Design brief:
Subcellular location: Nucleus; Cytoplasm; Melanosome; Cell membrane
Keywords: chaperone, ATP binding domain, stress response
PDB class: chaperone
Number of strands: 8
CATH topology: Heat Shock Protein 90
Distance between the termini: 38 Å
Protein name: Heat shock protein HSP 90-alpha
Number of domains: 1
Shape: globular
Bound molecules: Onalespib
Order of helices and strands: EHHEEHHHEEEEHE
CATH architecture: 2-Layer Sandwich
Oligomer: monomer
Structural class: alpha+beta
Family: Belongs to the heat shock protein 90 family.
Strand order of the largest sheet: 1-6-5-4-7-3-2-8
Helix content: 25-40%
Radius of gyration: 18 Å
CATH superfamily: Histidine kinase-like ATPase, C-terminal domain
Amino acid sequence: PMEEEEVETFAFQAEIAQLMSLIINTFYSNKEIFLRELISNSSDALDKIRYESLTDPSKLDSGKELHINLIPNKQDRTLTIVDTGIGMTKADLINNLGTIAKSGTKAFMEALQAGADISMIGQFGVGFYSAYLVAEKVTVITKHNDDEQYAWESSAGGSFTVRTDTGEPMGRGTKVILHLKEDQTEYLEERRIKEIVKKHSQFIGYPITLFVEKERDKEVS
Ligand SMILES: CC(C)c1cc(C(=O)N2Cc3ccc(CN4CCN(C)CC4)cc3C2)c(O)cc1O
């Protein structure tokens, strides 16, 4: 008791659940495209707030800088992507992250079943789920103007939660935290991240900064 937090439990829409189970339980080569999908989503969100701001500068009250940060953390085997885009409302999380059918799900599963490369995922409108190629749990923290901050979370298994987040306030935008699987820690390495960004995500119209830890003082190693 004491403190109270709204936390809502949802089932993924049946075909989304079937897709996630394929993604997780089937071997697929060329998983590095998960990063491309995340950066694409950030870029679209950033485009949206920039566009709205042409007409209403006040929409930038919550964060004037439009950018993306990539944060690998070897301490807890996470890779976080943060952007200062338009963010999502509660309904946007619920609609976009699982509760309803997505047009391309079935066809995408049929393509995978035929041997398509996982890279096609983005075209089918289910790109977010590529996170599950590398992560056993994904947390999405989001904040849209005129709404409160929310945190979506799922370790697959057919369920996800949406909670009102009173933690680290983001101002405005989305932060995706990938808890990487043991056989996917390569994505924590600066060398690998740089390689995949150069390969798949060139000319993103916003600065991308990689946070690195290379100067830690020995006295606090
Ligand atoms: C977790 C994924 C999905 C993700 C989302 C965002 C984010 O906050 N977004 C807000 C937003 C607004 C517009 C668009 C462009 N399209 C999307 C499809 N829609 C039906 C029409 C508008 C995209 C987004 C994504 C994010 O910043 C990063 C993420 O990884």
